[PDB]
Amino acid sequence: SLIIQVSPAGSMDLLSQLEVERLKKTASSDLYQLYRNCSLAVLNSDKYKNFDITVMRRERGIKLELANPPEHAFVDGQIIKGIQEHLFSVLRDIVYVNMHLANATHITNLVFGILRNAGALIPGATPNLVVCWGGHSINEVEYQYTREVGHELGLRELNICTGCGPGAMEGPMKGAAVGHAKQRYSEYRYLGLTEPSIIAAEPPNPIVNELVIMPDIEKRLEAFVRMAHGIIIFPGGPGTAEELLYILGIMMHPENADQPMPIVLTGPKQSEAYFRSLDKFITDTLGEAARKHYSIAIDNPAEAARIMSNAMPLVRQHRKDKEDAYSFNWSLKIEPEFQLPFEPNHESMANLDLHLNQRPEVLAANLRRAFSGVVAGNVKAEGIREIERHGPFEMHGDPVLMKKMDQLLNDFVAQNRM
């Protein structure tokens, strides 16, 4: 085989044998297969079953031996540096997560420790991080619009925190690269968060300069909202629904009523119908109270970014008022309903409680779980495989809710978002 050796890139710390011993290609540990599949997914921005990776503890730290790596990670026979660093980010995070399996508090403290360990939480930094959410499968006008928003974020020296993969997860950073270079903002941060079961489907771009691999969707979602100083939401499908519900259920909590921090739904003029309908689904379900937590801004990349930028002062002053950190919103209340890992199967979906009856937060947590199940069914290994052994996932409850959930899901199919 072709052995490509990769030397340590952007500052990985030294590791002990103990830390790397579960990644040896042996028994399974199942840890090796998980480490392998993440690393292949990163080299990849049945197809590659003869790919392998070996971790070697050497004089300047770990060197990676790649056996039969994807040939498009290469530029003129070299591995793009961005992709190098990503391979080391995957090693760092699988390792930390592994030394730290040993409750709400546990989870939030874990999410903190992972992000601090990845260098994602910068001590003296002042608020400027915008989470951007949006669909992986979007047409050209939609894509160009996310590029322009990211350009307008760059011009204002804002940083981007986003998921990984194509579509809306990739437009903003490319726009930002140009907006940033116009402002000479060389300290830009492009954070892509992923988790092992979605990374193959939605692989990170090399332009991402801070890849962090969370252990599951729930913890990644927690990461996103604890770090966000502002959120921009583009049109998307089920995964983007999930995210919106996640944040609205949290922001409707009575204890979060003072959390400044804007949410801006934005998209180009053609996504007007998309937005009237999503906005209606929201207010037809969680209800009217929810409208106050986001705004809609169509056809104006600059107004989007400007709303993030102008909020940074309020965010910052709010964290001083709680005596909270800038980088991690510890005082945000996130109830266990939003943390509980959801494993989607026919029983767990069918056990979802979907009633207009409930307090809007608890209703939002259930729907979050609902959307997450549609995603898992669509893109994840185990989720797809349950939709093969048993056909589609089934859900029920309130007839009023089921009608509209159903409607939104059909719009997503109709609009090619699935």
Add this chain to the structure above:
Amino acid sequence: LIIQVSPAGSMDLLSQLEVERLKKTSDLYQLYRNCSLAVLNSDKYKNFDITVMRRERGIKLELANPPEHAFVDGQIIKGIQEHLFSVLRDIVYVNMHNATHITNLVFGILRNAGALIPGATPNLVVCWGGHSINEVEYQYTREVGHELGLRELNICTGCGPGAMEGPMKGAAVGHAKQRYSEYRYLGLTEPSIIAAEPPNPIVNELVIMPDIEKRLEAFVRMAHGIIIFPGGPGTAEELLYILGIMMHPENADQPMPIVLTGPKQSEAYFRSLDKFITDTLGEAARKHYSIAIDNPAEAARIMSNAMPLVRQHRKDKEDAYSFNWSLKIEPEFQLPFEPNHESMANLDLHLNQRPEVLAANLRRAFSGVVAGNVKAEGIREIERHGPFEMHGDPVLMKKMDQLLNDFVAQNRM
């Protein structure tokens, strides 16, 4: 509107003597004002003025009614700020200062501006191409830029829209994937073109040369490779310049790659140019460039694989990596053309000429086409007595004429 602008370690101190030259007093102030205005506009702004202030930490600039599009939520974009200081810097250097003299002036200007990096290895790619180009050409330029960025190559080009713009936008993306934080985007302009082709703020090294010929020389002395995209008379000028120079029998060993490249749609444009080039300069010319269509990677890869050759050849002439002293450029490439009806009419355009002399006159021919179109003084004189008229042997005149018509036909004008 009144805004002040302070430098960010991008501006040396100046004495009162240097500055006094620049009070709203007048040759110098005017040129410095119009250069600075242009930079903020990347006619309609006659109330604009700028005041150079010497202050406790050096220069502050005070801006009277500066163009609103220079601003993002009411601050001036940092790159434009840097360009205002590059302008000051270069105006002062030049107007505070024999083929030999000219090249030594070009050197001094680039050195003074930081654009010649003593310890650096060759990776600067000169990029030439049209200012007015279609979506598909533009997109191609951006992909080439992306491919140059992925290979840690630096860009040096003119200013303004079109092909002067897309390659840096692409590189920003390719350099970022590559963590090439040290990238260099050199934009060379000159004061009577700057307003028409204003520097984008993404340019992080703007240099104002005295004139077109001095920019041309700057381009070719700093290039370690050249990539030429489809363009108009401006591009046709640059191409005649380099090939003119490259054909000099004492330049045979110079290994700078020259690549004409474009999208698949520009195949006919290119065949038309290869023709119109070997016809005028004769077949021996083709040995000095190549053509790569529909492949942004190959064009950036040829640049990349010649860097070790350029590096070795410079080491063989005990010559600098940053400045090609050893390249031989004859005085007919250097002489600053002020194109007018008279100078234009007067040009030796004759197949009868050995290529290099011919090149240099083509160079001037195309230069006055450009100046006839965009410069103030040109736009005045070709409106005061009509077409700058051209005279030479008639096979040339008609086939030089096809190409000029193609430019128009392709909206390159």
Add this chain to the structure above:
Amino acid sequence: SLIIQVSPAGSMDLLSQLEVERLKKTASSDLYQLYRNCSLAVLNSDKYKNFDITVMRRERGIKLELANPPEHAFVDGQIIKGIQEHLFSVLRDIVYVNMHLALTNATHITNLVFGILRNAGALIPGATPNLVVCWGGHSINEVEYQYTREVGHELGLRELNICTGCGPGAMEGPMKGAAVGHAKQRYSEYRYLGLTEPSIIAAEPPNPIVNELVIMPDIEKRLEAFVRMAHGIIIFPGGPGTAEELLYILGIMMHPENADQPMPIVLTGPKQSEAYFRSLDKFITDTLGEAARKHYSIAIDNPAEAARIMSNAMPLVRQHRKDKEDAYSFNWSLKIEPEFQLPFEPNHESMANLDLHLNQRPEVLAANLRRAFSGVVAGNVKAEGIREIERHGPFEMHGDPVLMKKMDQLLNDFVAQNRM
């Protein structure tokens, strides 16, 4: 009301509330007390009954609030910046050891050592070997001080880094000498690593010139940290604390599995320390035997030689670590047997129970001598150990008669030459 807030610049990481509350700021809290004390000692480089320190979680990270810190930590009303950094290193290391009750015990210890050091940023993965460990007496005459200053200068001119204990005397001259040699050589990435431990840091506080302080949990963990980071070791004249160090490394380096470890050891001093090194060397060979001799040399009256031996070995240390597939910054392949790791708690049972007889592999006699000297130190300068002297009488040692003779002479020399 003298109350001063200290900010970090960089190199304080964020902490969680869990982390900060585990400090237990209370009054009966032994941990906090140990934290308060290490932090007092850093500002002092009992008389300060009312010194207090508070750790605040703030928007930009940790800020510290000092109530009644000592006055000499101040230059015109401001705490010297090296000192401020010192306080955050203290907090970093107390907290990291506290969150780690994290194999085969020997492995747990070395991995703990590696963990503390790595967490402290003291193990730079990319760095080429250039770290020289310097050991030497805390109480030395000006001729010796001046000699260690001049070695430090020669180490600086050759762009080597220094790793050393904390406090006065030979723990201090070399860094001052290196500041000069490094400035001359434009080596701005110089590293002055000062290692200490809670129970000695008050007696031997860190000089603000140390740019990486690390607080290890005990004396044995620091000894290990020194030998695993060392690329080279220089040993100046010293007392029982320096003899401990010497016997520790020689014990280790005589192990056949360590035969190929190329880190040089140079005992060096001014011309007038010749009788000193005559007797030290004879004592090494008398106890550990003549095999000990191949592991060190002695360079008298020549600072440039001692540095040049360090400097010229660095490419050998380099080649050797790659031959062992080991790291540059941390020597995992070096073998250190448990008797060099096991923490010693000096009292009369423990001192009397030492095995000081000739009939044992020298590595093992080394290991026992290491604790003997350790006990002399503790009794001399540590709180708990100064009390056994107080409330019991002086430490009692027994063993092979010829060995006790030379060991008593050595200690009497130390006392005589005012090294203790």
Add this chain to the structure above:
Amino acid sequence: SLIIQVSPAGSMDLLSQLEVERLKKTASSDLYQLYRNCSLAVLNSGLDKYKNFDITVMRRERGIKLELANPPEHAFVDGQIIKGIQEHLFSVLRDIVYVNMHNATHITNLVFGILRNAGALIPGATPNLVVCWGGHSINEVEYQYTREVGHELGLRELNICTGCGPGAMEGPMKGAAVGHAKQRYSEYRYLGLTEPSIIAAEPPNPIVNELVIMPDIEKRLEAFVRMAHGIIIFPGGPGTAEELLYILGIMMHPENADQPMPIVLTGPKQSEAYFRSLDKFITDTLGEAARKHYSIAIDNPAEAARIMSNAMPLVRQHRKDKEDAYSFNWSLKIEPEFQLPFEPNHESMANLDLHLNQRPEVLAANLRRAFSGVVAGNVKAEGIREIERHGPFEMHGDPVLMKKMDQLLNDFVAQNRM
């Protein structure tokens, strides 16, 4: 013959052939000899001795390389030129070349341009530069005192600007290396100014990190006093006396009355006599009106440094009040008598107006000249040849002044300062 090549790092620009050819080894272009002497003095830090030394400037692929034919080897470390020495060699080249490519106003603008070209005037910088003056020839007690002052300067994050050479010219940078490292002040600045006719007698220490070659003693004096933020003066001989009279003569000008740069004479306890005597020289000659421009701090390194430090915000406020630069005191008034270069011979020395009856400032200007000639005849090439051709320089004037000057100069000899 031993050839050593020198590579620059950064901190040397490219030069043209027009620029280099000026320094080819020629029969005797003064320019080669002077570049050569200057380069040889820098290698000698630490005369027909190195008659077979030569240096060749080469234009090479990364800029200039120097080829040393038979340098002094006595200061090499393990066969290599200490990096600070290599930088000095390129500082000499830079400065010989700049002056060789180049009326009160003209003199000042020249000083500015040489300093500007040398990197020695940093736009952004807040006032923090302390000129230290002091004897090249001093005992261990005095030397140790200068080092502790340098230490107390570094503790306060102040920079040092000084003459080159041994004694009080090196001690302070040595204390400052320790003080700065304690304070983590990595951006420290140690400016050593010098000029071609005295550089061999006072060679730059490699610890200097900004060597500047001024063209003559007067332009160095001007550079000193336009750059300074404060001035410390230690005991010294006729070169330190020259400096003291220079700055006093300047600071008594009516127009310089608001110029707030402090001047502090300081020394160890043993220099008390020296100072009583120096202070009465000053007051007997320039008058009581002189005492107001300095003070005297004996036996207290911290207090001298603290006076400089405490004065930085005052210097800052004054430059803004006079609308002047922070790095270069354009508004300070220096009369032509302080600028005009003085070539010491017997005529020019005899011509000195040392009359009792004269403006104090002008007396100080002629006393400045006087000591400059005493220095020139002790250490300068053309100065001694004048001594060799002719015997000692004869001065005359008001006889009371003459016995005092005579007393001070005899004291210098007595005290080992000549």
